[PDB]
Design a protein around this ligand. Structure first.
Ligand code: BEF
Ligand SMILES: [Mn+2]
Length: 130
């Protein structure tokens, strides 16, 4: 997949407010193909529907947390390469290590600025040649 207007994003967080921030930032950046999920299970249901090129995900969520979500994606043959940007209040170095080692494409700590989201997305786009 490529970082063009068509790139389809999945935004995952148990709080509407945080999903709404991310969706609106993505709109500003020119990405209007954006769906939302409320937890890891919900996310996987939509991912399995097909077509997604990018996941932005919270950590602390009911039913399936974001670290489990990330691990599932990375271990699944059909989506193991999917970009996953963690966007979370979890700020301990050991959280960052766990997510990094699990295969996070990037990691943004809440609260975050519009500029921070943009540059961390762009960093992932460049790393993956999108
Ligand atoms: F709930 Be998240 F991890 F910010
Ligand atoms: Mn949460």
């Amino acid at each position: 997949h490529m970082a063009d207007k068509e790139l389809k994003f999945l935004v995952v967080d148990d709080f509407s407010t945080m999903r709404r921030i991310v969706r609106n930032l993505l709109k500003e950046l020119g990405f209007n193909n954006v769906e939302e999920a409320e937890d890891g299970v919900d996310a996987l249901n939509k991912l399995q529907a097909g077509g997604y090129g990018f996941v932005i995900s919270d950590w602390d969520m009911p039913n399936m947390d974001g670290l489990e979500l990330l691990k599932t994606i990375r271990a699944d043959g059909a989506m193991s390469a999917l970009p996953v940007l963690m966007v979370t209040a979890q700020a301990k170095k050991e959280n960052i290590i766990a997510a990094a080692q699990a295969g996070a494409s990037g990691y943004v700590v809440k609260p975050f600025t519009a500029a921070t989201l943009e540059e961390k997305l762009n960093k992932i786009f460049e790393k993956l040649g999108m």
